[PDB]
Design a protein around this nucleic acid. Structure first.
Ligand SMILES: Cn1c(CNc2ccc(C(=N)N)cc2)nc2cc(C(=O)N(CCC(=O)O)c3ccccn3)ccc21
Ligand SMILES: CC(=O)N[C@@H]1[C@@H](O)[C@H](O)[C@@H](CO)O[C@H]1O
Ligand SMILES: [Mg+2]
Ligand code: NA
Lengths: 41, 251
DNA sequence: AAGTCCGTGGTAGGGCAGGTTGGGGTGACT
């Protein structure tokens, strides 16, 4: 991922956006995300 | 959410609740895209046909919430709105074209296990994920059928072919919206409902494992009717407006 | 598949640009 906005106006958060502390950060998958993944095939 | 399930704790940490102060009621969903910017639907703040017209002081936002009711100490956070920006091309009468608003928090919110922003799509994520049959995730505390739920609901819905969207409604739809939901012949069901409007339609990239908000819950004829689909605001298409508002008026 | 359409009101002012707004894409239609 690469940033698009200026943190001064946008705020913090963009660098690490869309990665959940309790799932992606822990290498745990939620109970239905697999459904999404399988739809992209 | 109709035909959904209970969200797991921390499953949608960009979920935001948009409340009216007095009398206290849940108005809409919304999403956290940074420590101080929130995305929602324009009609949540301004919709003259329902004499809906809201200023910054009328509203409250609650973040990091699982249970609709009880206060969740050291988990949820309260915030006030500094300023609201509705898209100038928002059409509240004909077709809800460009149904999007940006909302600036009066102070930055701290991130946690329960509070974390969603990514905004770029051209390539739009090109890769916006395909008929590809599924995204809708979340909210709106009605379970056409009883508002105890805890946040989640359902996964396929993006639909454009010609089907168009034939599903008399409304003159535009390139600034898309539709999602199962067809009658697919057997499966599910949809957003009243109270889910303004919440995010998210999608997980198989390329970088990140969640992207591709859509905003905008409008639908009833909820979960056969031959009807939920309409979502096309976030990527409006990303330039987002950037301009944030550049021109941020912190 | 040569191309052509996506602004002057509309959701709405003062004006024919552009602004927080008429870009370019899941392009669509012929
Ligand atoms: C339900 N809902 C909401 C908000 N909550 C919401 C609820 C459910 C869903 C959902 N079912 N996923 C998604 C959002 N706003 C709505 C505006 C109209 C409406 O304005 N029009 C005219 C303009 C236009 O909508 O084009 C329209 C459409 C068909 C007929 C007549 N009128 C109908 C329904 C609306
Ligand atoms: C259509 C509509 O009701 N919009 C008005 C808006 O023009 C006004 O600036 C705001 C604050 O008074 O209240 C509302
Ligand atoms: Mg104009
Ligand atoms: Na449906």
């Amino acid at each position: 991922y690469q940033t698009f906005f200026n943190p001064r106006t946008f705020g913090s958060g963009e660098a690490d956006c869309g990665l959940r502390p309790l799932f992606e950060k822990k290498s745990l998958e939620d109970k239905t995300e697999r459904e999404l993944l399988e739809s992209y095939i | 959410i109709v035909e959904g399930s209970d969200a797991e704790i921390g499953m949608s940490p960009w979920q935001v609740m948009l409340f009216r102060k007095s009398p206290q009621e849940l108005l809409c969903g919304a999403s956290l895209i940074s420590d101080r910017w929130v995305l929602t639907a324009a009609h949540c703040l301004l919709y003259p046909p329902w004499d809906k017209n809201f200023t910054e002081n009328d509203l409250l936002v609650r973040i990091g919430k699982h249970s609709r009711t009880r206060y969740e100490r050291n988990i949820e956070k309260i915030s006030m709105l500094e300023k609201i920006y509705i898209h100038p091309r928002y059409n509240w009468r004909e077709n809800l074209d460009r149904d999007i608003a940006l909302m600036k928090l009066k102070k930055p919110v701290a991130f946690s296990d329960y509070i974390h922003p969603v990514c905004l799509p770029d051209r390539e994520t739009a090109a890769s994920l916006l395909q008929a049959g590809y599924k995204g995730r809708v979340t909210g505390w709106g009605n379970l059928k056409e009883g508002q739920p105890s805890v946040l609901q989640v359902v996964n819905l396929p993006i639909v072919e454009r010609p089907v969207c168009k034939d599903s409604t008399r409304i003159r739809i535009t390139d600034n919206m898309f539709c999602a939901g199962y067809k009658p012949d697919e057997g499966k069901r599910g949809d957003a409902c009243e109270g889910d409007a303004g919440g995010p339609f998210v999608m997980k990239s198989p390329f970088n494992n990140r969640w992207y908000q591709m859509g905003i819950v905008s409008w639908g004829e009833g909820c979960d009717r056969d031959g009807k689909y939920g309409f979502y605001t096309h976030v990527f298409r409006l990303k330039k407006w987002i950037q301009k508002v944030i550049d021109q008026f941020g912190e």
